[PDB]
Design a protein around this ligand. Structure first.
Ligand SMILES: [Zn+2]
Length: 195
């Protein structure tokens, strides 16, 4: 990622990202925007075109008014864990909401990076017309969909494998190289999508 392109994408993200009212680590919110800025500018401009907002949160997801309906709701597969959506740090699809500070793997979620994974869902659904459900991607998923691990989740849901692969592709050079090695067809597919 070249520095001038990053700044251009951050400028675009200034028209996408919404910062919260409450108090939060401004430097960490900025770091999240910096990581999002590695996403290909064409996707970012398309999110902006669709008026998609990336809402950064200063607290729990379910303490946001528009997600309060998820209070106490147990996510699929989380039965018996004692955890609920109140414990989920982010979501992506038709909207994007992300708790500041919870980017890294293990911060209440299993993704390599929260904001890239969830924003990938929004790009998939809003920008790319659910390409993760396409026949082309389904063929790739059938072969490579377990190769980032979490086989009972990423390996089962092509939308999740897409989002995680997208996050590997764009997080940093290390994860990008790892994806190329582990999932070469997925890597080529993403490379060509951004052409
Ligand atoms: Zn996901």
């Amino acid at each position: 990622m070249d520095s001038t392109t990053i700044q251009q994408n951050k400028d675009t993200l200034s028209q996408i990202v919404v910062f919260p009212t409450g108090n939060y680590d401004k430097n960490e919110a900025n770091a999240m925007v910096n990581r999002l800025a590695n996403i290909d500018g064409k996707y970012l401009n398309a999110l902006k075109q669709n008026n998609l907002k990336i809402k950064l949160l200063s607290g729990k997801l379910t303490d946001e008014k528009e997600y309060a309906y998820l209070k106490g709701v147990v996510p699929k597969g989380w039965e018996g864990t004692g955890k609920t959506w109140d414990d989920v740090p982010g979501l992506g699809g038709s909207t994007v909401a992300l708790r500041i500070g919870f980017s890294n793997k293990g911060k209440g979620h299993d993704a390599i990076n929260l904001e890239l994974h969830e924003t990938a869902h929004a790009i998939d659904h809003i920008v790319l017309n659910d390409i993760s459900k396409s026949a082309q991607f389904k063929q790739i998923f059938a072969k490579e969909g377990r190769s980032l691990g979490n086989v009972n989740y990423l390996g089962v849901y092509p939308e999740e494998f897409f989002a995680e692969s997208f996050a590997y592709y764009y997080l940093n050079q290390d994860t990008n190289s790892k994806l190329k090695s582990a999932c070469p067809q997925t890597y080529s597919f993403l490379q060509n999508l951004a052409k």
